Ligand binder design. Structure first.
Ligand SMILES: C[C@](NC(=O)CN1CCN(C2CC2)C1=O)(C(=O)Nc1cncc2ccccc12)c1ccc(Cl)c(Cl)c1
Lengths: 300, 296
């Protein structure tokens, strides 16, 4: 029993964190086999952050300009290349702690663990979700760039995020490990604003099923709804549309609890209409949207 | 910016998790140097233990079986002496924590780490964890520089879904026993110093709506705290909040008057750090550590 926001054990990722220094900038790198991955903005100076030409800046760099540090050992850079917004520093030593890994690009609503680092040293691990507006609501200070988001299924690390920047609202933007930004963001100091965020509806439903599995039933009702009527209501509360894919994904939780997805959708509509009335669901006074259907099944 | 419930990096603890099997029971063990620590309920515990032999305990570190060469009991923890010292043994200490103190839990099943989360030792000595069957022997810890302080070992789930366990010397937190009997968690209270630390974290993050021009005496605040099932705030707590008070410019008794107004009037549809409830599972140290980026 119990339901916590749970992160994956970070050990397999800790053994990959290195510090990358180029000129005055110091950030984190991910050392896998003989390559160190980090945000390409590590090559940027002061007057070339509004409109940096990364190809022009990288061509002027040599391997010895990049100082890579793994613990108290300095690694030797023997090559450098750029793949989208990520810089790949070829090093002369393969990381012996390299776990079984994959690079996966995730969709909005997906959750992952973040290992927050500073100067190549892990300082904390927390759980995140990719927001529908493609930002992540993280906890990062200056120096956290290069910190990564990941999931661990079986003994394999799926790296899904690399931190690149903080938007003016305090939310965070980054890329997958192939350097492709999540969302319409760019690694430029140009005026960028996160779009209006919405609640991840399928995740709220999964969390309502977790509450039912844990014995909380007060919010349930005798109503059901059509998928379209639910979406017309949910949209008015800035909730993401619920698709047939989402209804299908909730199938196992519906089968386990005996509550049809559209029946739980009608409980959700009622919660949106009434609020919680001084009650909590799984210790929360707000509807939680950072647990996916897969997280709920895994934790329960 | 941002404020998350953040656990310590679990790597140093993952390298210590082993699976202990004795008869039909399988749970987790903590392998440090040449000793495996686990709940004694894996086996009148002195009468039960005397009947066991080393070969009855199957210890597994990954796909390698460890051989037990001795066994002894220290309070509610069983200590299995093994032939091999754990090469991954970090710098560590066994520390007993106080209610209100926070720690990270590495939840394990069959000696395999599956999740990490941050929680607080409640004033009623339970932890509001997330554990299923097989999680016994999962440990709670903090990291100081490169030293792991082990503070908790999971033993059981109480009928309300809350958890109970011991320090690494086998002493329970709370008035609990490791036996099948009627046990109930006492009425819980809110960790007042932690709520204040979290209100300072909200101020550091730009959430200032709850601030007011008022201050209060420590006695008037404690009279209100008692009324709302909040733990008494001591001069020690006020002193610990000193750095956060200095950084934000809000005296502790000034933040107390904000807390008092929140308790008597509610949040009024408004939220603090994305929460509609007052969070009490961040200590003053946790807030400083997260709003300053201390590394391990
Ligand atoms: C590296 C970063 N540089 C800055 O923003 C630093 N700077 C720049 C403006 N300003 C001046 C000193 C007062 C700063 O503070 C960044 O946003 N990283 C940070 C990451 N996570 C959390 C942060 C929390 C506070 C601060 C910075 C954070 C950055 C900036 C613009 C771009 Cl286009 C990109 Cl790709 C990256």
């Amino acid at each position: 029993s119990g339901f916590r926001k749970m992160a994956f054990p970070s050990g397999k990722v800790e053994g990959c964190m290195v510090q990358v220094t180029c000129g005055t900038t110091t950030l984190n790198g991910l050392w896998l086999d003989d390559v160190v991955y980090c945000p390409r903005h590590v090559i940027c100076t002061s007057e070339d952050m509004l409109n940096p030409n990364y190809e022009d800046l990288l061509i002027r760099k040599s391997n010895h300009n990049f100082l890579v540090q793994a613990g108290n050992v300095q690694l030797r850079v023997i090559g450098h290349s750029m793949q989208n917004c990520v810089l790949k520093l070829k090093v002369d030593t393969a990381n012996p702690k390299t776990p079984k890994y994959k690079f996966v690009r995730i969709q909005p609503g997906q959750t992952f663990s973040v290992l927050a680092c500073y100067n190549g040293s892990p300082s904390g691990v927390y759980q995140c979700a990719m927001r529908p507006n493609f930002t992540i609501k993280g906890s990062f200070l200056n120096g956290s760039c290069g910190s990564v988001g990941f999931n661990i299924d079986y003994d394999c690390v799926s790296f899904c995020y690399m931190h690149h920047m903080e938007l003016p609202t305090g939310v965070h933007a980054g890329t997958d490990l192939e350097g492709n930004f999540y969302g319409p963001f760019v690694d430029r100091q140009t005026a960028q604003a996160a779009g209006t965020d919405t609640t991840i509806t399928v995740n709220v439903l999964a969390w309502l099923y977790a509450a039912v599995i844990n014995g909380d039933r007060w919010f349930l009702n005798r109503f059901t709804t059509t998928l379209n009527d639910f979406n017309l209501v949910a949209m008015k509360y800035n909730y993401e549309p619920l698709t047939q894919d989402h209804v299908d994904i909730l199938g196992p939780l519906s089968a386990q609890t005996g509550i049809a997805v559209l029946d739980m959708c009608a409980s959700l509509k009622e919660l949106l209409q009434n609020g919680m009335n001084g009650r909590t669901i799984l210790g929360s006074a707000l509807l939680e949207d950072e647990f996916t259907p897969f997280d709920v099944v895994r934790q329960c």
